[PDB]
Design a protein around this nucleic acid. Structure first.
Ligand SMILES: [Mg+2]
Ligand SMILES: [Mg+2]
Ligand SMILES: [Mg+2]
Ligand SMILES: [Mg+2]
Lengths: 143, 18, 111, 52, 192, 108
RNA sequence: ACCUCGGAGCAGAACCCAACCUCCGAGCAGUACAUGCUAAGACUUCACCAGUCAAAGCGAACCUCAAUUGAUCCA
RNA sequence: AGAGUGUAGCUUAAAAGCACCCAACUUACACUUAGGAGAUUCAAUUGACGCUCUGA
């Protein structure tokens, strides 16, 4: 017999980013009556302030995996006025780049109608889609 | 519940006068 | 002389059927009632008659979280905007903590 | 006030349903699902058998 | 049968009188922010961050990384202020901002991010995947010196690995090319 | 990692072939505990790996063994205890506890 | 005076409980017919006859109100 | 002459969060969208340039 054939009938995985990569992870359904309901794996958290524009990507637990804000010197020195549309466009582009460099390429964007009707959010979504990451996560296998 | 210490937490009409 | 009529009503048998601690499977109705008394939280769906049913197998928990109304419901919108700076609601939410996993890895063949 | 009529399909004869309609209006020409075709065809109002 | 509350009520710090003088919530975003900020405060009753398993977040770990270099923050702040003031004097940037057409280079911002808060994002992404939980068993560090590794497969492109990339085994059959800045007088030990 | 003084170890060395899975049982915790006051971590980079067609050739001409297979199985669905008189139940209630969907015959 | 059903207090915080105890009502409606077909799990007006919610799949673009009603035979 | 002091109008913040105004809708208020101006007073925990109080 070969001593390297120690496989065992049961095999476990110690990676949290595993169940959602095979479309077998359960989504925390329910809520319904509130908006941002927890039926997803990754969200696109956007915070617009009169001074800076910050965008984050959080998981269903409550921790951020990647964020993009104008407070960082890497973005603040390449543009002017962290309030116009080009600032949020560059923030969306650098966030798409960082998420492509991090492997994540599926997130759910659930904004408000008054913000979705604006132009900054539309251009941010366009820059996110043109980067290589499409929004709207697919369904779950055996939900 | 009425007897639990968390009684009267969902009250909201007392903070408005309209 | 017997002016009132129609007061011969019956009970709707509405109430909580599964308290905190019972092992509730997937599909069991938590509680049927009128008006949103216990708002759904995690793994708790709703229907047409404002009923509560579980979605996964586990232990049903009853906590109190914040209440964030939907922007499309204008009634709740004005009810929230009529609140002073620093007023919360905090209603009772129903949550179902899952215990059994949704699958695992098992060896089949060996080629 | 209202009236109940039956809608006959153009493609795949044999499948008909019932739907409400106003009494002072004209006929109906809606889009209803047809199981024998598994698509969407036209339905025409024909033969009323109810006067509610 | 009435029991006293085991803590301060969430709607007790305000007074029920003179409500017409207090400023009401003029919008819904303020209420949403207030709710999401109050939901993070540790309460004394049953909350969501208790039953669904949080792996005990209030727990200080141990840092086993290199300390940050001593850099004067006031000098850096005044230099950044002078830089943004000299950049604001341009009129072409103003025209580009007014015409809604202003692009920024990607390589420059990538290099500046890797030089600045790069290690912080790398550490938070490593702790998100649970690397420090399985490797050092809770102990975490911060990669100060940047690291660059690129595989060699075809003949023109490359297969880089960053902070959570995806490399196929058919594109990682040979030893990659590890490149990192180092001085003459220090040894390193690579582990995979 | 980053070590201060030049220190050499021999109890963690591997042979030139090193194609045995029993000897590659490496543990980073014990390796860092044995060398704590010498090496210091300073770099980290991780990626994701999936299955492809090269795994077969690897297990063939690199480990001298067979390729193990797996399958994401799921637990069986829950069903209550089958009573004697299922009051208000559809006709498909007997098929929920039925083993095989074939007409079985006993003494006949 | 009434013949069916729902709501408010009696019945106060899981549930049920009657009176020829005091009041509002209902035999319907403002707009699209995927108001398509199957299929785990429950409540059930204190029995039965009845009524209601829903996992998932094939199929499709990406439902509001409180009672609001009619069984066997036959045509 | 003595004392209290020291981040723009605010900070049991360390260059951020609250504030202000203008352009679009509104009889009007208001949400929202599109924009703008804002600060660690000086030399290395120290001493002095600004305000207030107690006086003459
Ligand atoms: Mg009654
Ligand atoms: Mg009765
Ligand atoms: Mg019953
Ligand atoms: Mg469905």
């Amino acid at each position: 017999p070969v001593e390297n054939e120690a496989v065992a009938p049961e095999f476990t995985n110690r990676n949290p980013r595993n169940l959602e990569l095979l479309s077998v992870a359960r989504k925390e359904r329910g809520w319904r009556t509130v908006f941002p309901s927890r039926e997803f794996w990754h969200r696109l958290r956007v915070i617009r302030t009169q001074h800076h524009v910050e965008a984050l990507v959080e998981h269903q637990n409550g921790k951020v995996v990647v964020s993009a804000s104008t407070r960082e010197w890497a973005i603040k020195k390449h543009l002017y006025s962290t309030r116009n549309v080009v600032a949020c466009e560059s923030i969306g582009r650098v966030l798409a780049q960082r998420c492509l460099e991090a492997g994540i390429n599926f997130m759910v964007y659930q904004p408000t109608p008054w913000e979705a009707a604006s132009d900054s959010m539309k251009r941010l979504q366009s820059a996110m889609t043109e980067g290589g990451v499409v929004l709207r996560e697919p369904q779950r296998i055996y939900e | 519940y009425k007897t639990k210490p968390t009684h009267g937490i969902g009250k909201y009409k007392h903070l408005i006068k309209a | 002389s017997s002016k009132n009529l129609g007061g011969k009503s019956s009970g709707r048998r509405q109430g909580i059927k599964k308290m905190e601690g019972h092992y509730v499977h997937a599909g069991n109705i938590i509680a049927t009632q009128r008006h949103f008394r216990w708002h759904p939280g995690a793994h708790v769906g709703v229907g047409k008659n404002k009923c509560l049913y579980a979605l996964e197998e586990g232990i049903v928990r009853y906590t109190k979280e914040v209440y964030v109304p939907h922007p499309r419901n204008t009634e709740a919108v004005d009810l929230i905007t009529r609140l002073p700076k620093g007023a919360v609601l905090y209603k009772t939410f129903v949550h179902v903590v899952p215990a059994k996993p949704e699958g695992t890895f098992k060896l089949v063949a060996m080629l | 006030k209202n009236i109940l009529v039956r809608m006959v399909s153009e493609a795949g004869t044999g499948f008909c349903f019932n739907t409400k309609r106003n009494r002072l209006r004209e006929k109906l020409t809606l889009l209803h699902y047809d199981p024998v075709v598994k698509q969407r065809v036209l339905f025409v109002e024909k033969k009323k058998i109810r006067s509610l | 049968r009435r029991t006293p509350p085991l803590g301060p009520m969430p709607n007790s710090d305000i007074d029920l009188s003179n409500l017409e003088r207090l400023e009401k919530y003029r919008s819904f975003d303020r209420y949403r922010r207030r709710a999401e900020q109050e939901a993070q405060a540790p309460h004394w009753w049953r909350t969501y961050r208790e039953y669904f398993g949080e792996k005990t977040d209030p727990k200080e770990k141990i840092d086993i990384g290199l300390p940050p270099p001593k850099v004067s923050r006031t000098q850096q702040l005044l230099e950044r202020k002078q830089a943004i003031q000299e950049l604001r004097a341009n009129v072409e940037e103003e025209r580009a901002a007014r015409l809604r057409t202003a692009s920024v280079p990607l390589d420059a911002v990538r290099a500046e991010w890797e030089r600045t808060c790069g290690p912080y994002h790398k550490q938070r992404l490593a702790e998100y995947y649970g690397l420090y939980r399985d490797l050092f068993h809770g102990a975490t560090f911060v990669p100060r010196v940047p690291l660059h590794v690129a595989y060699a497969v075809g003949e023109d492109d490359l297969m880089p690995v960053y902070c959570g990339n995806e490399v196929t085994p058919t594109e990682a059959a040979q030893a990659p090319e590890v490149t990192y800045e180092a001085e003459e007088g220090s040894l390193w030990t690579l582990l995979l | 990692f980053k070590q201060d003084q030049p220190i050499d170890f021999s109890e963690d060395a591997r042979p030139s072939p090193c194609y045995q899975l029993a000897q590659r049982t490496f543990r980073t915790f014990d390796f860092y505990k044995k060398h704590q006051e010498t090496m210091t971590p300073a770099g980290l980079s991780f990626f994701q790996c999936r299955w492809d067609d090269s795994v077969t050739y690897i297990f063939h001409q690199l480990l001298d063994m067979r390729e193990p297979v797996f399958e994401f199985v799921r637990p069986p669905p829950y069903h209550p205890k089958q009573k004697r008189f299922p009051h208000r139940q559809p006709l498909r209630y007997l098929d929920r506890y039925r083993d095989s969907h074939e007409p079985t015959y006993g003494i006949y």
